[PDB]
Structure formats: C-alpha cells, structure tokens
Amino acid sequence: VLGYDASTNSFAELDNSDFVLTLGKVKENHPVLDFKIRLSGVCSVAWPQSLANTADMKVFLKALLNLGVDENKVAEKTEGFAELKASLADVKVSEEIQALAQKYAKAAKPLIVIDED
Amino acid sequence: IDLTLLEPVFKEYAGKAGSIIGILQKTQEIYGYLPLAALQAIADNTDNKRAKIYGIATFYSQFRLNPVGKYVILQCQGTACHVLGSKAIGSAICDELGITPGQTTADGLFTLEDVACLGCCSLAPVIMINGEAYGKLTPTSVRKILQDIA
Amino acid sequence: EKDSQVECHKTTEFDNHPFIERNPDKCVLCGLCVRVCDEVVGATAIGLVGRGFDSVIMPEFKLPLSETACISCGQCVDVCPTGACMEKQVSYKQIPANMDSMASVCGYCGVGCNVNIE
Amino acid sequence: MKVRVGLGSCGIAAGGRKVMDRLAQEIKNHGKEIELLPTGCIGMCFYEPIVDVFDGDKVYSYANVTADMATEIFNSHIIGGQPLTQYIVSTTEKPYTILAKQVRIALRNCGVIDPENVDEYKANDGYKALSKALKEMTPEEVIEEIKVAGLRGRGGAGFPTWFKWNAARQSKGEIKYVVCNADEGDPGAFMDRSVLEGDPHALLEGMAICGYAIGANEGHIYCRAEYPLAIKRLEIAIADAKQRNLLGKNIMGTNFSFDMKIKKGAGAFVCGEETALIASLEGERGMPRLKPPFPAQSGFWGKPTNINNVETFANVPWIMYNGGSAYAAYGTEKSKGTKVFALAGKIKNGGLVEVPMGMSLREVIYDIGGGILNDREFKAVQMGGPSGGCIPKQLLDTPVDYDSINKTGAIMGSGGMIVMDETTCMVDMARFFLDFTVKESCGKCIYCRIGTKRMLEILERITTGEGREGDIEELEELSISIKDGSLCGLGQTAPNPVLTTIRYFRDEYEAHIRDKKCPAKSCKPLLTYTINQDNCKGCTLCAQKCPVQAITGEKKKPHVIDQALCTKCGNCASVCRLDAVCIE
Amino acid sequence: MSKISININGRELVVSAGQTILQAAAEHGIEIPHLCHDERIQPYGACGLCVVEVEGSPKLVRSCATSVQNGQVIRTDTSRTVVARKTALQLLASDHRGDCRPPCMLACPAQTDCQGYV
Ligand SMILES: NC(=O)c1ccc[n+]([C@@H]2O[C@H](COP(=O)([O-])OP(=O)(O)OC[C@H]3O[C@@H](n4cnc5c(N)ncnc54)[C@H](O)[C@@H]3O)[C@@H](O)[C@H]2O)c1
Ligand SMILES: Cc1cc2nc3c(=O)[nH]c(=O)nc-3n(C[C@H](O)[C@H](O)[C@H](O)COP(=O)(O)O)c2cc1C
Ligand code: SF4
Ligand code: SF4
Ligand code: SF4
Ligand code: SF4
Ligand code: SF4
Ligand code: SF4
Ligand code: SF4
Ligand code: FES
Ligand code: FES
Ligand SMILES: [Zn+2]
C-alpha cells in the first residue's frame, strides 16, 4: 500500500499525539509500550473485540468518508480511490462505528498502534 | 548663529521622553533649516546620543539641512497633478529658474522642493508659494506668476 | 557576475582610523554593528544615515571615527558577517589566512576576559 | 440672514480669503446683523469657493465667486434680494444632483456647522451620542453594538475589531493607550485632512467614546505638521471641550476622565504600520518592527495599545447614537458601514464622495463624477494609491467592498479614486507609483531596499525605449518575491501596481518593448512626428512655436519635420488648429 | 518540563523553552542561514535568510525571532524557503564590490594562494 513495510512514525512521537487507537493486544504482548502510553497521559481508545470482522472495518471506512474527507487530494495522491468509493456504496453505519469514526476524525494528530501478533 | 534664542526651546522641552522630533521641528521653524551647530547644541545639554539625533534628522523625509530662499516653491507631485501633467510644469520651472529640485537660486529668492501631495487635487496642477496655492495651472501661467512675484 | 545597467554604490571613503577599517561597499546593512555599539558598549559612536538605497552606516555627524566617542573595543568588527568592518593588522603585514587558534585569558585587567589568539 | 463660506485648504487654492474679507467689509459698511460662518468643503472641491446664502428657509449656492463677484452678490442679492440666475447651480428645490445618491454619514457636518464652534456641533445633534454612551450604556454594550454594526477595521487592514479592540480592552495593564493614525501619507487621498478641517469635534467625541469603552484614560493623535489649519482647528476644539467640561476630568459628572495630547509627526509615509508609528511616537526612527509581538501585547513603551483610523472612531459614535442594527441594511453582507472616497484625475465632478458599499464603479465614475473630463473615453481607475492596484475598462461592474477589490488584485487602502482615460500611458503610471514607494522606504529589509529599486530601473528603462525581451518575466519574478519576503507592509503591497497593470494592460508593455511605440502617445521618447501634406496649408504656427527650428518650410506650403533635430517636446501639435500633426 | 520536543525537517528533537528555532536547530546540527542574528541581543529581521515553514502558519516565519513551543512541525528546505533565500542572496550580490580572491591566485591553474604565502 505505502511502499515500505515499516511504521511511518517513531515511538518518541507517542507523547505528542492527542489520540491513540490501539489494534490488537498491545498490553499483553508488548507491555512496555503500554507503560509508555499510560504514562504519556494521552487519550487511548482500544478497538472493540466485538468487531472481529473486516466488514466492520469497511463500515469504519464508510463512516470516515461520510464525515467529509477531501476527495481531490486523495484522488490525486492514490490509485484506485474511485473503486474504493464504489465498493462502499451500500454500506450502512452503526452507532459505535460512528462514535469511533467521530473520535478518530475529530482529533488533530492521531496515531494507530497495531500489534502484529 | 542665534543659539541664545535656541536655548529656550530645549529649556522648555527638556524632561519629555521622545522629544527629539519636536525639538528638531522647532529648530527648523526658527532657523529655516537644521545647521550643524544647532544639532551640536541639541546633542549637548540634553545628551540624547548625538548619532541618534543625526540619524533622526536625516531620515524623516522633510528636514532641511541647507538654507532656503525667501519664497519656497512646493510643487504638488501627487497622482492627480501627475495625471494632468505636472512634469511639464516642473520642466518649465527648471527652464525659467535655472535650478533643480532641492537647490536654491543664486539670488536666494526661490527654492524648489517636491512634496508628496498638497491635497487640492481638484485644481491640479497646484503650486504652493509661501502658503499661497495656485491651481488649474499651465506653464505660461506659472511663468507669469513667477514674473509677477519677482 | 554583474550587469552594467544596474547601479552599485561606489565609495571614495577616507577613514584612516588606526584600528578599525570600515568599507561601505561590502555592507549588507544587517545593523549588527550599530545594535552592538548602542545596546552593549553604549558609546553610540556609529549610526544609520538615510533611507532606502541611500542608507549607510557612518559615525556621528559624518565625522571621522577618531573624532567621536569610540572606545576602539572592536565589537563592531567581531559581530560583522562580511568584510565591511575589519580590525587593523597586528603583524608586520597581515593577510587572509586560516589562522591557528589557542584559548587563553587577557593579561591586562582583573576582569579576566577569555580570548582566542589567532 | 445667514452666510456660510466653505473657506478651507482648497479655498486657499482659490479666492479664499478674498471673498471672506470682501464680504466682511461689505457687512461692516452696511451694518446689517448677518451671521458669517466659515465652514469646510461639502465635498465638491470643484466650483470652489463655495458660498451658501440663507433667505428664510431657502438655501442658495452660486459659487465660483471672486472679490468682485462677492461685491456683486452683496449689492444685488444680500441687500436687494435678487438672485443672479447666471451663476445659480444649486437651490433648495434643486439641490446638488451629485449628493442625491450620496448617503452622507462621515461628512454630515462638513459645510453645515462651524468647526471652530462647539455650539454648532451641539445644535447639529452632536455630542449626544457621547452622553448616551456615558450614561445609558456599558462598555461591553458598546462593543456588542459595534459587533452588530459589523465594524472590523478601516484604513486597509481587515482583521476584526473584537479580536483587536476588545482584545486591547481585555489586555492586562493599568495604563492603556489610544492612537488615531491621522497621518494620510497617500497621495491624492485627503479624507483625514478634510474631516479634521471640517468636523474635528466628531473625531474628538469618537476618540473619547472608544477611550471610555476600552478603558484607556490617555490618548494621542499622530498628525502630520504639514496639516496646520487642521492642527489649529483641532486645538481650538480641544480648548472648547476642556472649557465646556466635555474633556479632561469628570465629563458630565461621570467618573471617566479622558485627556488629549497632540503629537506632530515629521511626515513619512512609512510612519504608519502601527509599529513604525509607535517608534515615531517613542522618539526614534520610524522603522517597522517584528510582528509578533503585536501592539495589543506590547505597544507604547511596552504597554498595550489600540490603533485605528479616523474613519473608525468617527463611525463608532454615530453607530452608538442610533444603533448598529440600522446600519446592517446598507450595503453588502460581509462588510458594513460606509466608505469615503476622493475622486480625482481625468474626471469632471471631482472631489470628496461619501458612498455605501455594493454600489457599482460605473455609477461612481459616470453618475456621480459626471463621466470623463473633455468627454474622453474611460480607460482605468486606480484604487489605494501607490500601494493599491488598477481596475480596467472591463470591470466597472465590480461592487466596492473588501472582497471584490481584493479579488481583482487591488487594495482598498485609504480609498482613493483615480480616473485615467486613453491619453494616460499605463507603464508610465506604474513607473510613477513605483517611484513613490522607492522614495518612501525605510531601507531595513533587503527586499524593499534593493528589489523595489531594481523594478524601478526596469520600468524607467522600458518607458525610454531601451527595453529588451523577457523584461516582463524579470518584473513578475521580482514582484512575487518582494511581495512574499518583505518584512513591512509597504514592500509587501509595493508591486501591486505592476502586478495589476501587467495582467490588465499586458498588451501595452509589448507595445513599449517590441514595437517601441506608446499607444497612449504620452510617453515622450517613444514617439515620432509627421506632417500631413493634405490637411495643412503653411501658416507656420507650429514652426514659430518650436524655438529650435527643426521644422523648415515656406509660407502657404506644408513644412518638413527634421527628426534628427526635434527633441519631441510635444508643442508641434498642441497649437495646430487643423490637427494635421500625426504622432506615431 | 515534560520534555518540550519539536519536530524539524523530519527529525524529532528535545529542546528547552525560550530558545529560538535557530538556536534549537543549530544545537542539533541543522544549518539555517542567517546574517542579522546575534543570540545576545534582540532580534532585528533585516536579512530574512532564516525563514522556515511552520505548520499552522500561512506565511514563512523567521526562526531567529520565534521561540520553540511543544509539538510544532518545521521544515527548512522547502521550495519556498530556498526560493526566498536565493532571491535575497541575488539582491545582496547585486550591490557588493570586492575581490574575494586576488587576481594572482585566480590566474593560477591550480588556484594556489599566492597572496597567502607571499
Ligand atoms: N489607510 C489604510 O488603511 C492603509 C494605507 C496603506 C496600507 N494599508 C494596508 O495595511 C495593511 C497591512 O496592515 P499592518 O501592516 O498593520 O499589519 P496586518 O494587516 O498584518 O495587521 C492587521 C491588524 O491586526 C492586528 N492583529 C493581528 N493579530 C493580532 C492579535 N493576535 N492580537 C491583536 N491584534 C492583532 C494587527 O496589530 C493589526 O492591527 C495592508 O493590507 C496595506 O494595504 C492601509
Ligand atoms: C505604509 C503603510 C501606511 C499606513 N498608513 C495608515 C494610515 O495612514 N492610517 C491607518 O489607520 N492605518 C495605516 N496603515 C495600516 C496600520 O497598520 C493599521 O491602521 C493598523 O495596523 C490597525 O488598523 P485598524 O484599526 O483598521 O485595525 C498603514 C500601513 C502601511 C504599511
Ligand atoms: S555589521 Fe558589518 S555588514 Fe552588518 S551593518 Fe555593520 S558594517 Fe554592515
Ligand atoms: S570600536 Fe566599539 S565603540 Fe567604536 S564604533 Fe566599534 S563598537 Fe562602537
Ligand atoms: S581583562 Fe580588562 S583589559 Fe582585558 S579585555 Fe577584559 S576588560 Fe579589557
Ligand atoms: S518593507 Fe520596505 S518600508 Fe517595510 S520595513 Fe522593509 S524596507 Fe522598510
Ligand atoms: S504642421 Fe505646423 S509647422 Fe507644419 S506646415 Fe502645418 S502649421 Fe506649418
Ligand atoms: S521637439 Fe520641441 S524643443 Fe525640439 S525642435 Fe521641436 S518644438 Fe522645439
Ligand atoms: S570575502 Fe565576503 S566581504 Fe570579502 S569580497 Fe567576498 S563576499 Fe565580499
Ligand atoms: S494631488 Fe496635487 S494637490 Fe493633491
Ligand atoms: S537572521 Fe536575519 S531575519 Fe532572522
Ligand atoms: Zn508610454
């Protein structure tokens, strides 16, 4: 997707985010990362365990798109955004997905911490 | 030099912070310009950092460091007078008087200066001579006016 | 390279100060010299004269630097980024060179300022 | 009987004191009890010196009056009761058609009241808003009424008052300062001098009101010293307000005290900018400083300061009296209030015009100004003076406002109208406007110090005939860089004349460069002269009026112009009655 | 306290409050041009060579006159900053008279410093 199979930001930038979205079991597998996130004091929201399906993530993408993203910049910077918009045409949005998407899109500098295990 | 009567000016304006501009304007109103001796007298007895006095006197767009004639010519060089052709009037003044802007005549009667705008743009071109303004002007008119004054 | 149709100010300066050499042709008008001589030294021996292109830095009343309140401290030389202000030659014939530098302390006052001997 | 004379600065550029002292001598000889009142200009600076005569409830104005004309007026109309219909241009039943479309708000006392008398201002519903704001309204109510009135800022700028004026009031400090930037360094814009010489009491009331609202007890007027009549009238008004308990300590019993001081500036155009003006007030060289910090946090001697134009402080009480909800109806939506303009140039009815916004420029130039002088063809209109831009013959439908004028590349600035017809060279106008900014730059930052002179050298080389290919590219490359990198506001809006006349009159730059000829034919060395042998018969009128004798010929025969000897001064065609002198 | 950290030119750095961006970048080996900056006196803003781009600001800011805050993103090598610095240096070189190197050295094919060893 991006070109390099690596994280796009360092651990040293975890203290200046205003939103951290945690995917996976970061606490159980890499617990010092959770120590750092807890001591930083930023607002951390974990991805719900009841959303273990990719279709829920597609609903998340649809809710993010319905919140007014810039279509022209992502159209000139990506390949295949038109088909991505087409494939999310008949996707309905639930309440908890809407809340998570609002929390993510509201924050100015969010980070996503994904546990590879 | 009339320093004896220059003494009341800084004897009265003393104690006011940022009073260099006011002292310089009063000195120019007295002498017609700012002589180096008057600047030296201002720098003394009021400290005020002589270099800063000279820099202030130089900047300020208007302070004369040279003597002027009895009748001071101020030609309005604003947009409205330039539209109606004040360049021809300036050329006529330079041709008839034989002087350039910023200088003084040999007999010490006329002094040519260029100002930003006199403000009477309805009667452009305008010429100020000792507070008397001539508007809706032509080179023949200014030649006749200067001949009538002289 | 320079175009002949534009004008650069050429000077015929005569400032034979024994210690400080001023070249207005090499001045970028950063104002560091006047700022230091006003705010730090407090002599205020130099200042700005003019406006626009005619802005030039020169001593009080366009006098020579030896006829004014200069201390000959050389702080204007030390803050200048170009060759507009230079100090005079201590050696027999000074030259542009990469000098070796040794850190010592001044041997004149009890203040004990730290120096770099080049 | 009442006689009003609009004797002012423009009056001195006319008969002026002659009509005044002749009328005084006539009333001294006759002995009648007639009130002679000196007033300011109405705004029609043409047809000066204005004289208004009151017969009962009727007012007549039949000016262009000299000493002999004033004597004839006294002999025929003031005593005999007979108007002179050959000089009548405005009556009570037939007022000025120019003021019919003008919503006079800023000049509601100009030409009506005596500026040197507080009694005339009080009788013209003046200082009542001061009492209303002092006794019936809180300063927060003043701010909110200003907010519903839609005021943001006058004299260029554009940032809203509530983020700077209310911010200045909310600024921490026991001492706050008010500065009225009453220096009008714009050539051709003279609204501040006209207001000062016509109605300084409104400005003093306004400054007192904003001082009461923002919690500042002491204020200063930054006024130029080439503005004496204005200084004398302002000091007379200040003395009167001090005497009548309108100024000083405990005005109308209210605890708020406000004192006035007059500071005479030395007259530099860069001594505005709210940071150079502070340095000028502080007794230093006016050189713009670094923003941030803003004067709202560190201004006069390190104390918070609010700086506004005369226009803003004039508008504030008149909003205060009636209410800002009334002024939301006039003009467009984004900006409210009224605009003050000075029309000049190749125009017929020039002078000061009061207008609301949204009114089309073709209305202002044609309907108000009477069209073009000598019935010539309209070419362009210049806004903002040397720091402003140019609007061509295709955009007279643009409404006057901040957004529309900002769209076309020009700047509101001081609000000056310059009208230019087809006989004005546009490249020479750009050169003139750039020469003004070259002569008025403090020379601190290197962009405005060197680049604005380099562009001037390019323009003066074009307007001679030594231009080359690509000079347009060098002009654009210099202009965008000077606009981006200049520290002060002067150099940022320095290349606006070039940038607006290079996209609206680009075809004339090529004519001055490639064809080496001037389309307006008013650009001296870029010309040539020919004699039409068919439409001229040897009267030797042109050759007699060329005192170098480069034109040779016999009587009753067409002559020949020697190109190598004539210097193209322009007098070879100014006197030819047959108009056979062709200029190419 | 809380480790004031800025992000300049892609790198994350830990700095101290009250310092300018120029000082903070130079402490960590990032070179920003400057001519009119002295850290012991007030800022001036004459040359304009210290311009950087800071996120949240529409126009270029002068790093000699803006103090560091927490979590601000700075770029010093963009197209706009390089263009502004090149234009400023061209305007400065439009007014400079001097010999950087003597004629004797520039005539030598190997560019030996003839003035230096003479
Ligand atoms: N008569 C005129 O109005 C006139 C004449 C010439 C030029 N100009 C114009 O002046 C304009 C430039 O104005 P400027 O040089 O004063 O700077 P600017 O426009 O950047 O500043 C605008 C105003 O907002 C204030 N301001 C900004 N941020 C603030 C904050 N956080 N707190 C408090 N106040 C704040 C500034 O102090 C200033 O009063 C140009 O657009 C130019 O065209 C106007
Ligand atoms: C060269 C120049 C001249 C200026 N002249 C004036 C002026 O004469 N009157 C004025 O009110 N503002 C003038 N300004 C703009 C001032 O900065 C502005 O008035 C001030 O910052 C706040 O204005 P405001 O009250 O409309 O917000 C000038 C700005 C520049 C760059
Ligand atoms: S320090 Fe040097 S370069 Fe800077 S203004 Fe002074 S003489 Fe010029
Ligand atoms: S040597 Fe010292 S006192 Fe003399 S001009 Fe330079 S800085 Fe000022
Ligand atoms: S130690 Fe004394 S003499 Fe030496 S540099 Fe310091 S102050 Fe001057
Ligand atoms: S832009 Fe021009 S007037 Fe403003 S500070 Fe720079 S040099 Fe001076
Ligand atoms: S144009 Fe003038 S000089 Fe030539 S023939 Fe006609 S009248 Fe004579
Ligand atoms: S161009 Fe003018 S000055 Fe020259 S000969 Fe002709 S009329 Fe005389
Ligand atoms: S070394 Fe520096 S000061 Fe000397 S000539 Fe070269 S650029 Fe100018
Ligand atoms: S434009 Fe000439 S007097 Fe104002
Ligand atoms: S170093 Fe010169 S503007 Fe900052
Ligand atoms: Zn031309």
Burial class of residue D288 in the structure, from the number of CB atoms within 10 Å of its CB (0-12 exposed, 13-18 middle, 19+ buried): buried
Report residue E46 CA to chain centroid gap.
13
Q: How many CB atoms lie within 10 A of CB D563?
A: 11
Report residue A116 CA to chain centroid gap.
15
Chain E interface, Cβ < 8 Å to A: 3, 5, 7, 12, 70-71
Greatest extent of chain C over all pairs of C-alpha atoms, in Å: 57
- Domain assignment of residue D561, yes or no: no
Verify that D170 and D295 share a domain, yes or no.
yes
Which residue type sits at A25? K
List the one residue out of D338, D340, D312 whose CA is nearest residue D178.
D312
Verify that D344 and D402 share a domain, yes or no.
yes
Copy the structure tokens of residue E20. Answer: 């300018």
Copy the structure tokens of residue D483. Answer: 């606009």
Residue A6's region, left for phi above 0, alpha for psi from -120 to 50, else beta, is beta
**Phi and psi at residue D360, to the nearest 5°:** -65, 150
C46 in contact with B at a CB cutoff of 8 Å?
yes
Query: In this structure, what CATH number is given to the domain that contains residue D125?
Result: 3.40.50.11540
Q: Which residue is closest to D571 within chain B, CA to CA? A: B88
Verify that D222 and D371 share a domain, yes or no.
no
> B41 CB contacts (<8 Å, ≥6 apart)?
B3, B6, B10
Quick check: bond before A48 cis, omega within 30? no
Cα angle value A36/A40/A41 (rounded, 5°): 130
- Domain assignment of residue D571, yes or no: no
Verify that D317 and D435 share a domain, yes or no.
no
Which residue has its alpha carbon closest to ligand 4 atom 4?
A: C70
Report residue D548 CA to chain centroid gap.
42
Tell me if E12 and A15 make a contact (CB, 8 A cut-off): no
Copy the structure tokens of residue D99. Answer: 């003021």
Verify that D256 and D304 share a domain, yes or no.
yes
- H/E segment holding residue D508: helix D506-513
Which residue type sits at D420? M
Copy the structure tokens of residue D111. Answer: 């030409």
Copy the structure tokens of residue C80. Answer: 């200048």
Q: Which residue has the tokens 């197209």?
A: E79
Q: How many CB atoms lie within 10 A of CB D155?
A: 20
C-alpha D80/C-alpha D76 separation (Å) is 5
List the one residue out of A70, A62, A56 whose CA is nearest residue A88.
A62
Q: How many CB atoms lie within 10 A of CB D89?
A: 14
Question: What end-to-end distance do the CA atoms of chain E give, in Å?
Answer: 57
C-alpha C47/C-alpha C56 separation (Å) is 8
3-state secondary structure of D400: coil
Instruction: Give the method used.
Output: cryo-EM
Tell me if E71 and A10 make a contact (CB, 8 A cut-off): no
Copy the structure tokens of residue A111. Answer: 């980070």
3-state secondary structure of E74: strand
- H/E segment holding residue D480: helix D471-485
Query: Is D108:D321 a contact under the CB 8 Å cutoff?
Result: no
Radius of gyration of chain A (CA): 15
Verify that D212 and D354 share a domain, yes or no.
no
Tell me if C81 and E41 make a contact (CB, 8 A cut-off): no
Query: Is D453:D433 a contact under the CB 8 Å cutoff?
Result: no
C-alpha D154/C-alpha D176 separation (Å) is 21
Burial state string for C21-34 with b = 16 or more CB within 10 A and e = fewer than 16: bbbbebbbbbbbbb
| E54: β partners | E74
- Domain assignment of residue D550, yes or no: no
Copy the structure tokens of residue D32. Answer: 């009648």
Burial state string for D364-387 with b = 16 or more CB within 10 A and e = fewer than 16: bbbbbbbbbbeeeebbbbbbbbbb
C-alpha pair distances (Å), A26 with each of A9, A100, B108, D222: 17, 19, 93, 66
Around ligand 6, the residues with Cβ closer than 6 Å are D 270, 288, 441-445, 448-449, 486-488, 490-491
Copy the structure tokens of residue E72. Answer: 């601000």
Per the document, the length of chain C is: 118
Verify that D33 and D95 share a domain, yes or no.
yes
Ordered DSSP codes for C35-61: HHIIIII----EEEESSGGG-EEEEGG
Ordered DSSP codes for chain B: --HHHHHHHHHHSTT-TT-HHHHHHHHHHHHSS--HHHHHHHHSSS-S-HHHHHHHHHSSS----S---SEEEEEE-SHHHHHTTHHHHHHHHHHHH---TT-B-TTS-EEEEEES--S-GGG-S-EEETTEEE-S--HHHHHHHHHHH-
Report residue B72 CA to chain centroid gap.
7
Q: Which residue has the tokens 């040539």?
A: D528
Coarse DSSP helix, strand, coil percentages of chain B, rounded to the nearest 5 percent: 45, 15, 40
Question: What end-to-end distance do the CA atoms of chain D give, in Å?
Answer: 60
Q: Where are the beta strands (DSSP E) in B1-150?
A: 71-76, 110-115, 127-129, 132-134
**Phi and psi at residue B35, to the nearest 5°:** -70, 160
Q: Which residue has the tokens 């000089």?
A: D87
C-alpha E16/C-alpha E18 separation (Å) is 7
Looking at the CA of C39, name the nearest ligand: 4
C-alpha B119/C-alpha D350 separation (Å) is 13
C-alpha A42/C-alpha E24 separation (Å) is 26
Query: Is B14:B46 a contact under the CB 8 Å cutoff?
Result: yes
Last residue of a domain, one of D395, D421, D447: D421
Radius of gyration of chain C (CA): 16
Residue A41's region, left for phi above 0, alpha for psi from -120 to 50, else beta, is left
Verify that D432 and D390 share a domain, yes or no.
no
Please give, rounded to a whole number of angstroms, the shortest distance from the CA of D567 to a CA of chain C: 24
Q: How many CB atoms lie within 10 A of CB D534?
A: 8
C-alpha pair distances (Å), D337 with each of D11, D147, D164, D331: 30, 12, 18, 8
- Domain assignment of residue D371, yes or no: yes
Q: Which residue has the tokens 């000083």?
A: D248
Ordered DSSP codes for E36-75: S--TTS-----S-TTEEEETT-SS-EETTT-B--SS-EEE
Query: Is D154:D146 a contact under the CB 8 Å cutoff?
Result: no
The finding on whether E34 has its CB within 6 A of some atom of ligand 11 is yes
C-alpha E35/C-alpha C27 separation (Å) is 11
Around ligand 2, the residues with Cβ closer than 6 Å are D 153-157, 159, 164, 181, 183-185, 269-270, 272-274, 307-309, 312, 489-490
Query: In this structure, what CATH number is given to the domain that contains residue D410?
Result: 3.10.20.600
Which residue type sits at D199? D
Burial class of residue E75 in the structure, from the number of CB atoms within 10 Å of its CB (0-12 exposed, 13-18 middle, 19+ buried): middle
The answer to whether the Cα torsion of E49, E50, E53, E56 is positive or negative is negative
C-alpha D361/C-alpha D380 separation (Å) is 11
The answer to whether the Cα torsion of D228, D231, D236, D237 is positive or negative is positive
* A15 secondary structure, DSSP code: T
Cα angle value C17/C19/C20 (rounded, 5°): 75
C-alpha D571/C-alpha D24 separation (Å) is 45
3-state secondary structure of C86: strand
C-alpha D292/C-alpha E66 separation (Å) is 8
Verify that D129 and D260 share a domain, yes or no.
yes
* C24 secondary structure, DSSP code: G
C-alpha A44/C-alpha D175 separation (Å) is 47
Rounded to the nearest 10°, the torsion over CA D277, D282, D283, D288 is -40
Copy the structure tokens of residue D199. Answer: 């109605």
| C114: β partners | C105
Q: How many CB atoms lie within 10 A of CB D443?
A: 23
The angle, 0 to 180 degrees and rounded to 10, between the axes of the packed helices D200-214 and D310-322 is 80
Radius of gyration of chain D (CA): 27
Per the document, the length of chain A is: 117
Q: Which residue has the tokens 């204007």?
A: C76
Domain range for D47 is 2-99
Q: Where are the beta strands (DSSP E) in chain A?
A: 19-23, 44-46, 110-114
Please give, rounded to a whole number of angstroms, the shortest distance from the CA of B40 to a CA of chain D: 18
Ligand 5: atom nearest CA of C105 is: 1
List the one residue out of D75, D88, D70, D93 whose CA is nearest residue D21.
D70
Q: Which residue has the tokens 């406007």?
A: D433
Per the document, the length of chain D is: 584
C-alpha D281/C-alpha D307 separation (Å) is 12
Query: Is B79:D347 a contact under the CB 8 Å cutoff?
Result: no
Copy the structure tokens of residue A60. Answer: 């998340």
Copy the structure tokens of residue A49. Answer: 């365990």
What's the half-sphere exposure (Cβ side, CA atoms, 13 Å) at E19? Answer: 16
> D487 CB contacts (<8 Å, ≥6 apart)?
D288, D290, D444, D445, D447, D448, E45, E46, E48
- Domain assignment of residue D573, yes or no: no
Q: How many CB atoms lie within 10 A of CB D487?
A: 25
Which residue type sits at D112? V
Tell me if E65 and D290 make a contact (CB, 8 A cut-off): yes
Report residue D421 CA to chain centroid gap.
20
3-state secondary structure of D243: helix
Cα angle value A106/A111/A113 (rounded, 5°): 135
- Domain assignment of residue D167, yes or no: yes
Copy the structure tokens of residue E46. Answer: 């004459």
C-alpha pair distances (Å), E24 with each of C32, E29, E74: 21, 9, 12
Copy the structure tokens of residue D141. Answer: 């109510």
Question: What end-to-end distance do the CA atoms of chain A give, in Å?
Answer: 20
C-alpha pair distances (Å), B40 with each of B21, B28, B54, D229, D461: 15, 14, 10, 32, 43
Radius of gyration of chain B (CA): 18
Question: What end-to-end distance do the CA atoms of chain C give, in Å?
Answer: 33
Around ligand 9, the residues with Cβ closer than 6 Å are C 26, 82-83; E 96, 98, 100
C-alpha D487/C-alpha D289 separation (Å) is 8
Verify that D309 and D366 share a domain, yes or no.
no
Last residue of a domain, one of D71, D99, D127: D99
**Phi and psi at residue E47, to the nearest 5°:** -70, -45
C-alpha D554/C-alpha D475 separation (Å) is 49
Tell me if D12 and B116 make a contact (CB, 8 A cut-off): no
Per the document, the length of chain E is: 118
Burial class of residue D212 in the structure, from the number of CB atoms within 10 Å of its CB (0-12 exposed, 13-18 middle, 19+ buried): buried
C-alpha D398/C-alpha D387 separation (Å) is 20
3-state secondary structure of D182: strand
Tell me if B54 and C47 make a contact (CB, 8 A cut-off): yes
- In D521-576, alpha helices (H): 541-544
Pairing of strands C56-59, C85-87: unpaired
Cα angle value D241/D242/D244 (rounded, 5°): 65
Burial class of residue C37 in the structure, from the number of CB atoms within 10 Å of its CB (0-12 exposed, 13-18 middle, 19+ buried): buried
- Domain assignment of residue D113, yes or no: no
Q: Which residues of chain E have a CB within 8 Å of the CB of C36?
A: 38, 41
Query: In this structure, what CATH number is given to the domain that contains residue D453?
Result: 1.20.1440.230
Q: Which residue has the tokens 């423009």?
A: D10
Per the document, the length of chain B is: 150
The answer to whether the Cα torsion of D403, D409, D410, D411 is positive or negative is positive
- Chain B touches chain E, with at least 3 Cβ pairs below 8 Å, answer no
Query: In this structure, what CATH number is given to the domain that contains residue D75?
Result: 3.40.30.10
* D51 secondary structure, DSSP code: E
- Domain assignment of residue D551, yes or no: no
Count up the domains in chain D and report the number: 4
Cα angle value C6/C7/C10 (rounded, 5°): 155
Verify that D189 and D242 share a domain, yes or no.
yes
Pairing of strands E5-8, E11-14: antiparallel
Last residue of a domain, one of D39, D69, D99: D99
Please give, rounded to a whole number of angstroms, the shortest distance from the CA of E64 to a CA of chain C: 13
What's the half-sphere exposure (Cβ side, CA atoms, 13 Å) at D115? Answer: 32
* D176 secondary structure, DSSP code: -
Q: Which residue has the tokens 């190109």?
A: D563
Copy the structure tokens of residue D119. Answer: 């009694």
* B104 secondary structure, DSSP code: B
Q: How many angstroms does the Cα of residue D116 sit away from the middle of ligand 6?
A: 39
Verify that D74 and D221 share a domain, yes or no.
no
Q: How many angstroms does the Cα of residue B47 sit away from the middle of ligand 4?
A: 18
